[PDB]
């Protein structure tokens, strides 16, 4: 159940993170530390790594809570593997 | 949405393929040619294909999308090559 194709909506350099529409109303939060090198450009900051509109494969590490979007990661948990 | 965590349920070496539970009642079918190299346990030869038994294991999860929907008695055809804008 816990896997999504997310679109980067907004990049926030002051948080070194991006907001992601993964199909919830609340955008998810994807910090630079949670971005796999497959997404890195051909010590980058978030602005160098992601761009609005691009899609990422994410899972939820922390559900929506209080006023916060889900904390997302691109490091997908896969059994056996 | 078209992305799933699929669990390998049965490997068929003579079909170079595996059955996959991706959350539907009917398992999907994942050909060896649709398995991306990141899933392979070792770098193999530039020539020929490995046995799928040396690529996948029962119970392993892979990320898949549906390439052809479930139709009639047939399961969905699956691929690990995920479509991503800007990739």
Swiss-Prot record, chain A:
| Chain intervals for the UniProt region annotation (Interaction with RNA) | 19-68
Location of the protein in the cell = Cytoplasm; Cell inner membrane
Q: What happens when the gene is disrupted?
A: Essential, it cannot be deleted. In a temperature sensitive mutant at non-permissive temperature, slow processing of the 17S rRNA precursor to 16S rRNA; a double rne-rng mutated strain no longer processes the 17S rRNA precursor.
What is the organism of origin for this protein? Answer: Escherichia coli (strain K12)
Q: What is this protein called?
A: Ribonuclease E
The free-text domain remark for this protein reads: The N-terminal S1 motif binds RNA, and can also bind single-stranded DNA (in vitro). The C-terminal region interacts with the other degradosomal components.
What family is reported? Belongs to the RNase E/G family. RNase E subfamily.
Which domain of life does this protein belong to?
Bacteria
Effect seen on changing residue 19 to A: Reduces RNA cleavage by over 98%
The residue ranges of the S1 motif domain are: 1-75
In its miscellaneous comment, the UniProt entry states: In K12 strains that are derived from W1485 (including MG1655 and W3110) the rph gene has a frameshift that leads to loss of its ribonuclease PH activity. In strain K12 / MG1655(Seq)* the wild-type Rph protein has been restored.
Task: State the function annotated in the UniProt record.
Answer: Endoribonuclease that plays a central role in RNA processing and decay. Required for the maturation of 5S and 16S rRNAs and the majority of tRNAs. Also involved in the degradation of most mRNAs. Can also process other RNA species, such as RNAI, a molecule that controls the replication of ColE1 plasmid, and the cell division inhibitor DicF-RNA. It initiates the decay of RNAs by cutting them internally near their 5'-end. It is able to remove poly(A) tails by an endonucleolytic process.
Relate the assembly described in the record: Component of the RNA degradosome, which is a multiprotein complex involved in RNA processing and mRNA degradation. Within the RNA degradosome, RNase E assembles into a homotetramer formed by a dimer of dimers. Tetramerization is essential for catalytic activity, but not for RNA-binding. Interacts with RhlB, PNPase (pnp) and enolase (eno). Interacts with DeaD at reduced temperature.
From Swiss-Prot, chain B:
How does gene deletion manifest? Essential, it cannot be deleted. In a temperature sensitive mutant at non-permissive temperature, slow processing of the 17S rRNA precursor to 16S rRNA; a double rne-rng mutated strain no longer processes the 17S rRNA precursor.
Domain of life according to the entry: Bacteria
**UniProt domain S1 motif: residue ranges:** 1-81
The segment annotated Interaction with RNA runs over: 19-74
Q: Where in the cell is it found?
A: Cytoplasm; Cell inner membrane
Tell me the outcome of changing residue 19 to A. Answer: Reduces RNA cleavage by over 98%
Q: What is the effect of changing residue 28 to S?
A: Disrupts folding of the S1 motif
Comment text on domains: The N-terminal S1 motif binds RNA, and can also bind single-stranded DNA (in vitro). The C-terminal region interacts with the other degradosomal components.
Cited function: Endoribonuclease that plays a central role in RNA processing and decay. Required for the maturation of 5S and 16S rRNAs and the majority of tRNAs. Also involved in the degradation of most mRNAs. Can also process other RNA species, such as RNAI, a molecule that controls the replication of ColE1 plasmid, and the cell division inhibitor DicF-RNA. It initiates the decay of RNAs by cutting them internally near their 5'-end. It is able to remove poly(A) tails by an endonucleolytic process.
Quaternary structure, per UniProt, is: Component of the RNA degradosome, which is a multiprotein complex involved in RNA processing and mRNA degradation. Within the RNA degradosome, RNase E assembles into a homotetramer formed by a dimer of dimers. Tetramerization is essential for catalytic activity, but not for RNA-binding. Interacts with RhlB, PNPase (pnp) and enolase (eno). Interacts with DeaD at reduced temperature.
**Family designation:** Belongs to the RNase E/G family. RNase E subfamily.
Q: What else is known?
A: In K12 strains that are derived from W1485 (including MG1655 and W3110) the rph gene has a frameshift that leads to loss of its ribonuclease PH activity. In strain K12 / MG1655(Seq)* the wild-type Rph protein has been restored.
User: What is the name attached to this protein's record?
Assistant: Ribonuclease E
Q: Which organism is it from?
A: Escherichia coli (strain K12)
